[PDB]
Design a protein around this ligand. Structure first.
Ligand SMILES: [Ca+2]
Ligand SMILES: [Ca+2]
Length: 135
C-alpha cells in the first residue's frame, strides 16, 4: 500500500513510479485528465505482449495493438518516428512478441519528458499525496 512518502518519492524518480502498480494507476488517472492516456495504455499493452509465446495470442494481441495505437486512423494512435513505424508495419505481417520494444521505449521517454512534469504540478498529484497522509 503506497504511503505519502512513496508517492512523493516519485517526483524524483519516474522509473520508480513506473515500476509500482499504484504509480502506473495514479499516473493513468492524471493522463486521462489531459487526454494523453493512450501513451500509457499502449505502453501497458506492450508489456503484456512481451510475456506471450503462443502464436495465436501474439498475432491477436499484436494486431489489436496496431489497430488501437499504431494505425494512422486509430483514435488512440500514439506518436512514433517514421523509422519505428516502418519496422512495425513489416513485423505486422509476421508478428513476434518483441516487435513493439522500440516503440515502447519511445513512448516511455515521451511520458517521462512531457506528461510526467505536468503530473507533478497538478492538483490531482497534490490530492493523491494528501489522500494517503494520516496526519
Ligand atoms: Ca489523446
Ligand atoms: Ca511461439
Amino acid at each position: 500500500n503506497p504511503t505519502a512518502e512513496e508517492v512523493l518519492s516519485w517526483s524524483q524518480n519516474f522509473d520508480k513510479m513506473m515500476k509500482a502498480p499504484a504509480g502506473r494507476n495514479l499516473f493513468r488517472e492524471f493522463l486521462r485528465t489531459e487526454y494523453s492516456e493512450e501513451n500509457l495504455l499502449f505502453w501497458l499493452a506492450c508489456e503484456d505482449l512481451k510475456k506471450e509465446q503462443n502464436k495465436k495470442v501474439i498475432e491477436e494481441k499484436a494486431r489489436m495493438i496496431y489497430e488501437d495505437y499504431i494505425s494512422i486512423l486509430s483514435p488512440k494512435e500514439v506518436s512514433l518516428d517514421s523509422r519505428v513505424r516502418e519496422v512495425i508495419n513489416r513485423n505486422l505481417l509476421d508478428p513476434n512478441p518483441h516487435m513493439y520494444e522500440d516503440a515502447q521505449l519511445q513512448i516511455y521517454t515521451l511520458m517521462h519528458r512531457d506528461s510526467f512534469p505536468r503530473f507533478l504540478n497538478s492538483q490531482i498529484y497534490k490530492s493523491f499525496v494528501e489522500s494517503t497522509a494520516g496526519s
